[PDB]
């Protein structure tokens, strides 16, 4: 957040979950980052740079996260036509 | 009557069988004298109890596995059941066929082999 | 009955956004709802929206994001005279800095920030933030 | 899938899926399990798609790879069928098994001596191991498990559908799971037969084991005679 | 005579990374929304700006066949004047032990606040970002933003918390039974929490999802550490 100078304030800028577009607080212990491993996709062997996600507790606790994690990987890979 | 064993007996009885499994017999008197040497039990009457329960446990340990304590040879046979069972080496019997409405899925996913057809009657409980 | 159409409309998109959705169905499609959502789209609280056509009155479908917190209606429709304005916007908005009271004027439907630059009072409809 | 046919399901594995009856799934359904099913028979039994099973296997396994420590991907199962399977899993691949009764508070205590902080979980059957799932949402653990048609989804991030009512469906699936993580991380890759098989991830069968061992001893004695 | 402390050997993973000093601020912790399970982590980062303000020391007591039995339940506030506050309750047989139990618990539950401006900028935020609420069982508060130099206009109870928060200007109003102050202060604390859980147009730009400290610093923790 900006000021007169454009100087940035706020002690931490919180992170905003992928499929809910809302922000998770300092205490919120049902919110998970989930690391998918990429592969080279020529031999199907692990190669470094991961795809990382974040999900909030609200969609987790109702049981909607399973669709969100699927759709996120469906707009990328690995998922073709499921 | 009464005389239901306390937890102080049942705690140490398990321990003494785990780490001195070999020394045990199944006689009262032999199992007493072993407990006297591998540990000190500060009373005499207490000693006569802990031996008798150690004896009573050792009867059951020579059958199937007890669920309160572990010994080595049971964890052997555990491993022997849990690395191969004699029932199969084949997956599952190598060829298993399926009925239609599964075949329609496979038709649209480029598979077209090893099937049977039976079109079983309507319906649930009917 | 369905006395006021716009008032029944906003509660759906309010309820839907809370549960976590991104497509809705709102009926029965008034022209008033269209120009409302047009202004609400420019600022960026909702995405593009598709008007289905029927002869009856139509149906509208919306694509939305979590940016919206709540859009409410204010009914019945009171007048504002550009000195009553400051009193309204204090009660109805979380902050001076952002939030947008909507209204209709003879110069068309618009936010309050625009109306002040045209010197036009008029009838208030709802709000959002 | 992703890569064109060097990750996509082979003709071989199809036989194993069908012989272990994984395709079959229970009578009752949930509204989160509607898409995974294709359809019903003429009888109460609903046929899980095997293509849809296969895609979910991969990113599940790829997440088990994505951690840089293999000693803190804590697997859990408490059903008897899922004891022998998980034990070989976490023995072969570096992982931590929690076999049998969970003994609650082991993801939130500072006094218990079985306290652990892992990152992932891999659970069999939500409705036997509901306890670790609830405690996962107090300390931010990603979660994976094996769902059936009638198993609800709640405090899980990804499902791996299966028949899993106590079958060869169980042990086969845990074997396949351990196969994939080695194709990406390990040097087992070649994707042509691995030495270890799914014939020891299957259930004990303790009374069936004792009877088979007795019959094998009788067959050994009669071969020697 | 004899010298040297030795205090705080971590049994917690997060605690060990702080003790080896590869986590450089609490602001990293909050960004991943981790629990904090030890009271020395916070007291390592801070500890020379944290004050306590014991609100009430309240008796409660039940009835048994031998008569009364009374335990003392005290509330204790905590906060430095840069944006971090907390609050805690605890009860025990005696007084001092309950107080010291609460001074530990309040450090554990500490959180940051988000401060903002009135309608214009001149640097250094002095008030609350947006108009928020917070309820605890029929008590609620309506923290309303205020211009500079008005001071905190509130009852005595929330005037403690908001002043420690560094929120120097605020208008408030209460609703319901504020006599039972345990509700009243927990409802204030509830409101003060919501400040970073309220979405504003500033935060609409998308996050970069930087990798976790748990992931990057895992190399030191492959010895026997848990």
UniProtKB/Swiss-Prot annotation, chain A:
Localization (cell): Cytoplasm, Cytosol; Cytoplasm; Rough endoplasmic reticulum
Name the gene for this chain. Answer: RPS21
Keyword annotations of the record? Acetylation, Cytoplasm, Endoplasmic reticulum, Isopeptide bond, Ribonucleoprotein, Ribosomal protein, Ubl conjugation
Q: What is the protein's species of origin?
A: Oryctolagus cuniculus (Rabbit)
Quote the subunit structure annotation.
Component of the 40S small ribosomal subunit.
InterPro entries with a match to the protein in the record: Ribosomal_eS21 (IPR001931), Ribosomal_eS21_CS (IPR018279), Ribosomal_eS21_sf (IPR038579)
Query: GO molecular function terms here?
Result: structural constituent of ribosome
A GO cellular component entry from the record: rough endoplasmic reticulum
Cleavable signal peptide: none
Q: Which residues carry this modification: N-acetylmethionine?
A: 1
Source organism lineage? Eukaryota, Metazoa, Chordata, Craniata, Vertebrata
Q: Name one Pfam family in it.
A: Ribosomal_S21e
Crosslinked residue numbers (Glycyl lysine isopeptide (Lys-Gly) (interchain with G-Cter in SUMO2)): 41
- Describe the family membership recorded for this protein in Swiss-Prot or TrEMBL: Belongs to the eukaryotic ribosomal protein eS21 family.
Q: Return the protein name.
A: Small ribosomal subunit protein eS21
Q: Does the keyword Ribosomal protein apply?
A: yes
Q: Name one GO biological process term.
A: translation
Functional description taken from the UniProt entry: Component of the small ribosomal subunit. The ribosome is a large ribonucleoprotein complex responsible for the synthesis of proteins in the cell.
Curated annotation (Swiss-Prot), chain B:
> Mind telling me what this protein is named?
Small ribosomal subunit protein eS17
Q: Residues involved in crosslink (Glycyl lysine isopeptide (Lys-Gly) (interchain with G-Cter in SUMO1))?
A: 103
The annotated crosslink position for Glycyl lysine isopeptide (Lys-Gly) (interchain with G-Cter in SUMO2) is 103
Give the primary localization class. Answer: cytoplasm
Q: Which organism is it from?
A: Oryctolagus cuniculus
Q: Which GO terms describe its biological process?
A: translation
InterPro entries per the record?
Ribosomal_eS17, Ribosomal_eS17_CS, Ribosomal_eS17_sf
UniProt keyword annotations, A-Z: Cytoplasm, Isopeptide bond, Nucleus, Phosphoprotein, Ribonucleoprotein, Ribosomal protein, Ubl conjugation
Top-level taxon? Eukaryota
Family from the record:
Belongs to the eukaryotic ribosomal protein eS17 family.
Q: Tell me the gene name.
A: RPS17
UniProtKB/Swiss-Prot annotation, chain C:
Whether Protein biosynthesis counts among this entry's keywords is no
This entry carries the following GO cellular component terms, namely: cytosolic ribosome; nucleolus; ribonucleoprotein complex
Question: Mind listing the UniProt keywords for this protein, alphabetically?
Answer: Cytoplasm, Nucleus, Ribonucleoprotein, Ribosomal protein
Give the subcellular location: Cytoplasm; Nucleus, Nucleolus
Q: What's the family?
A: Belongs to the universal ribosomal protein uS8 family.
Record note on quaternary structure: Component of the 40S ribosomal subunit. Part of the small subunit (SSU) processome, composed of more than 70 proteins and the RNA chaperone small nucleolar RNA (snoRNA) U3.
Protein's UniProt name: Small ribosomal subunit protein uS8
Per the record, the gene is: RPS15A
From Swiss-Prot, chain D:
Tell me where on the tree of life, at the top rank, the source sits: Eukaryota
| Region spans: Laminin-binding | 160-179, 204-225
Q: Which residues carry this modification: N-acetylserine?
A: 1
Q: Using the UniProt annotation, give all residue ranges assigned to the region (Interaction with PPP1R16B).
A: 53-112
Please provide the Gene Ontology terms (biological process) for this protein.
Answer: ribosomal small subunit assembly; translation
Listed GO MF terms: laminin binding; laminin receptor activity; structural constituent of ribosome; virus receptor activity
Q: Where is this cross-link: Glycyl lysine isopeptide (Lys-Gly) (interchain with G-Cter in SUMO2)?
A: 88
Kindly list the residues the record flags as site (Cleavage).
Answer: 114-115, 132-133
Summarize the protein's role: Required for the assembly and/or stability of the 40S ribosomal subunit. Required for the processing of the 20S rRNA-precursor to mature 18S rRNA in a late step of the maturation of 40S ribosomal subunits. Also functions as a cell surface receptor for laminin. Plays a role in cell adhesion to the basement membrane and in the consequent activation of signaling transduction pathways. May play a role in cell fate determination and tissue morphogenesis. Also acts as a receptor for several other ligands, including the pathogenic prion protein, viruses, and bacteria.
Report the protein name in the record: Small ribosomal subunit protein uS2
Tell me what organism the protein belongs to.
Oryctolagus cuniculus
Q: Which residues of the full protein are shown?
A: 2 to 226 of 295
